[PDB]
Amino acid sequence: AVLNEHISKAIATIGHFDLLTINDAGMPIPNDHRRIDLAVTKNLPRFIDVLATVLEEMEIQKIYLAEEIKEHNPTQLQQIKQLISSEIEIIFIPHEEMKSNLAHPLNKGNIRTGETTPYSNIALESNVT
Amino acid sequence: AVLNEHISKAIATIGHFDLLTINDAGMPIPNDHRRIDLAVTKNLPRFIDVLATVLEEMEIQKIYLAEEIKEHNPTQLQQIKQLISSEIEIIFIPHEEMKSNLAHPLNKGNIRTGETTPYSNIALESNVTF
Ligand SMILES: O[C@@H]1[C@H](O)[C@H](O)CO[C@H]1O
Numbered sequence: 434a435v436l437n438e439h440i441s442k443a444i445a446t447i448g449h450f451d452l453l454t455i456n457d458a459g460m461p462i463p464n465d466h467r468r469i470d471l472a473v474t475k476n477l478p479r480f481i482d483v484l485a486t487v488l489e490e491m492e493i494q495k496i497y498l499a500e501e502i503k504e505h506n507p508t509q510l511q512q513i514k515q516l517i518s519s520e521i522e523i524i525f526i527p528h529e530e531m532k533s534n535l536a537h538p539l540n541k542g543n544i545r546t547g548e549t550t551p552y553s554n555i556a557l558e559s560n561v562t
Numbered sequence: 563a564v565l566n567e568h569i570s571k572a573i574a575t576i577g578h579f580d581l582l583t584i585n586d587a588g589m590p591i592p593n594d595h596r597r598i599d600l601a602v603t604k605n606l607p608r609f610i611d612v613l614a615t616v617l618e619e620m621e622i623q624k625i626y627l628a629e630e631i632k633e634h635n636p637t638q639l640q641q642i643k644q645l646i647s648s649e650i651e652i653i654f655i656p657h658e659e660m661k662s663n664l665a666h667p668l669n670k671g672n673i674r675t676g677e678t679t680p681y682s683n684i685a686l687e688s689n690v691t692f
């Protein structure tokens with residue numbers, strides 16, 4: 434099995450209430466030890482493919498999305514909905530809040546993808562591991 | 563233009579004779595400052611896509627490939643030949659030496675991809691950059 438080293442590491446540091454984010458190419462991710470840059474070029478890797486992969490390696494209770502996704506990227510939102518269990522809660526917050534959450538005290542990592550479609554950003558809150 | 567921060571930073575330090583490698587998922591890359599892990603899952607990203615991207619950002623004079631790629635992965639060899647110029651030398655060395663070169667003194671970065679097809683590894687040698 435092939436997995437990202439930095440992602441597997443971060444997932445192992447993750448417990449109840451901890452956050453892990455997946456982001457598009459333009460999300461202003463703070464430059465620190467949480468930042469995990471997987472971007473290769475435009476749309477590689479895709480946000481959706483990285484999300485599908487991470488979800489196989491995690492127990493999630495809540496996800497956070499930009500309110501703006503509903504209007505500006507309904508295809509992404511639909512792709513996300515189709516991927517997650519129908520029991521996990523989806524909370525919509527302002528995109529400006531999604532940016533603050535990049536620096537959340539419980540944020541255990543910020544994954545950067547090559548995705549270029551707007552508001553392809555998510556935050557994943559762990560259940561009890 | 564979307565770009566990897568690590569790859570971009572490594573290339574900024576690359577001069578004549580310096581090496582940069584792109585590798586498949588199972589290649590034993592030493593866990594140091596040179597390790598740039600882009601692997602997501604099986605065959606994502608593909609070796610050939612990462613190679614294509616990097617060659618746009620770099621001027622190369624030679625490449626190193628495993629002798630083993632001729633028999634064991636001829637389609638990858640053909641894909642590499644299609645990507646590189648005719649005025650760049652291809653040198654075949656044993657895979658064991660490809661592994662050694664991950665620690666070469668002039669190695670400026672080891673990129674790991676999600677590639678699963680065997681011997682999908684390369685080392686790129688820089689020309690004069692200024
Ligand atoms: O790329 C991100 C968002 O996804 C949105 O596209 C606006 O710019 C950046 O904050």
Ligand SMILES: O[C@@H]1[C@H](O)[C@H](O)CO[C@H]1O
Nearest residue numbers: 586588589590680681682
């Ligand atoms: O993945 C690499 C090589 O490409 C080969 O497939 C053997 O295993 C690893 O050393």
